[PDB]
Paper text:
Fungal immunomodulatory proteins (FIPs) are a group of low-molecular-weight (MW) proteins investigated as potential anti-tumor drugs. FIP-nha (from Nectria haematococca) contains two glycosylation sites at positions N5 and N39. In this study, the impact of glycosylation on the bioactivity and biochemical characteristics of FIP-nha (from Nectria haematococca) is described. Taken together, these findings indicate that glycosylation of FIP-nha impacts its thermostability and digestion resistance.
To study the impact of glycosylation on functionality of rFIP-nha, two single mutants (N5A and N39A) and one double mutant (N5+39A) were constructed to remove glycosylation sites. The SDS-PAGE results showed that the purified WT, N5A and N39A were partially glycosylated, while the N5+39A variant was indeed unglycosylated. However, we only managed to obtain crystals and solved the structures of WT, N39A and N5+39A. Unfortunately, none of the structures contained a density indicative of N-glycosylation. SLS and native-PAGE results suggested that rFIP-nha and its variants were all homogeneously tetrameric in the solution. The Tm values for WT, N5A, N39A and N5+39A were 82.2 °C, 81.4 °C, 80.7 °C and 80.1 °C, respectively. Highly glycosylated forms of rFIP-nha seemed more stable, indicating that N-glycosylation might contribute to thermostability. The stability of rFIP-nha during pepsin digestion was in this order: WT (T1/2 11.6 min) > N39A (T1/2 1.9 min) > N5A (T1/2 1.3 min) > N5+39A (T1/2 0.5 min). Double glycosylation significantly enhanced the pepsin resistance. Resistance to trypsin digestion is shown in Figure 6: N5A (T1/2 longer than 240 min) > WT (T1/2 89.3 min) > N5+39A (T1/2 13.9 min) > N39A (T1/2 8.1 min). However, there were no significant differences in tumor mitochondrial metabolism inhibition among the rFIP-nha variants toward the tested tumor cell lines.
Numbering used by the authors:
A (entry chain A): 5 to 114
B (entry chain B): 6 to 114
C (entry chain C): 6 to 30, 34 to 114
D (entry chain D): 6 to 29, 36 to 114
The structure:
Amino acid sequence: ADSAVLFYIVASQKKLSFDYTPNWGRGSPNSYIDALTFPRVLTNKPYKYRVVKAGQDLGVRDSYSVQSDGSQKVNFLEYNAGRGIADTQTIQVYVVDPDNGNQYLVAQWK
Amino acid sequence: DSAVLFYIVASQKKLSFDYTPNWGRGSPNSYIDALTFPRVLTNKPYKYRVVKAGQDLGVRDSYSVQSDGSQKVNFLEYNAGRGIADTQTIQVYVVDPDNGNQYLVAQWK
Amino acid sequence: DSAVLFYIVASQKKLSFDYTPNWGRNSYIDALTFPRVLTNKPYKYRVVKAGQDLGVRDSYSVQSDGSQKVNFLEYNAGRGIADTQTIQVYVVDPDNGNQYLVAQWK
Amino acid sequence: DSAVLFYIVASQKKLSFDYTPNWGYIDALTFPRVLTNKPYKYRVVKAGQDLGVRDSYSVQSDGSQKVNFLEYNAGRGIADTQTIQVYVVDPDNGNQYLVAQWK
């Protein structure tokens, strides 16, 4: 039951809109996923992203900048030494809170 | 409160809401007779409880969520057909139909 | 819901509470006691009997052993409530007037 | 934060925990009474450097759990000069929450 939390948020911020519907970008070949873009990301803090590939923590990188349409791109090339991630691997993407370094899963591939 | 927001993101990828209060005024202008929210949450058919100057006016049935996402709370339905004099504090609570929990969403003075 | 739990651990490193409802019965329910209530704010309680809002009353003191008792005689014009009906008990937040369910009978 | 406190009260009506950091050169961190709803792991970060995750020691009968920094720092304690952050790791999603900090 998550109404108590939702309205804890409404209490703090009356007007809020976000969209973390995952857009998985595919390089060449299509087998590989090389990016993830969110249509509308939270902007209260300059969040960072951590990527996990098949159980391997690829660490934290600087975020690409929120674009004027509110979207943000995570470029997996920046985390994976210049290579896409084969789509048979599970990919986890975390937001990292800059204040305490907390990590929250926001996207998962398979 | 980042931990709570992303708890919401975890369960609800895409969410938009707007409870910026639009205080309606009858005639005379001194009286507030309504409150309108531009875009309410719709996951549950919430209702509204109104407290006028510390007096609990109780719960009533919600007006319809309109096609633009808006929802109106008519204080005439809580205050026996009179607006609320703007010198009184007004508290509006959403009521959770599952457990009857109450959460403040708008406050006049 | 682990994010929320550790949000609490974050704000408050050490915490113990116990709201396991001890109902006071022998067919009418005359009271409800909680072994260990939260004490960060002086909470009041609102009681609803079989859907009927009996409203808010002033709280009894938290006892030395951390317990607090809600006496339904103060809410129901001096009368117990028959187990027939569903009793809901809400904590009332004195800051904003919010209320959260914390106990239910049937 | 009362709204969230009582949401926890709602989900579990009886609960006690104690994460007041017992620091023991700092070799280790002990928590008198950890949550046990999941089998949490811990991640350590030293002076900004991610030491990563290690398997957890068993929760003691008195509810306490010990994090041993020798397992995270290649057999060496951490000098109190540096800031140590300690995160619980949620085994379901891999989320991490800060639960202790040294300066």
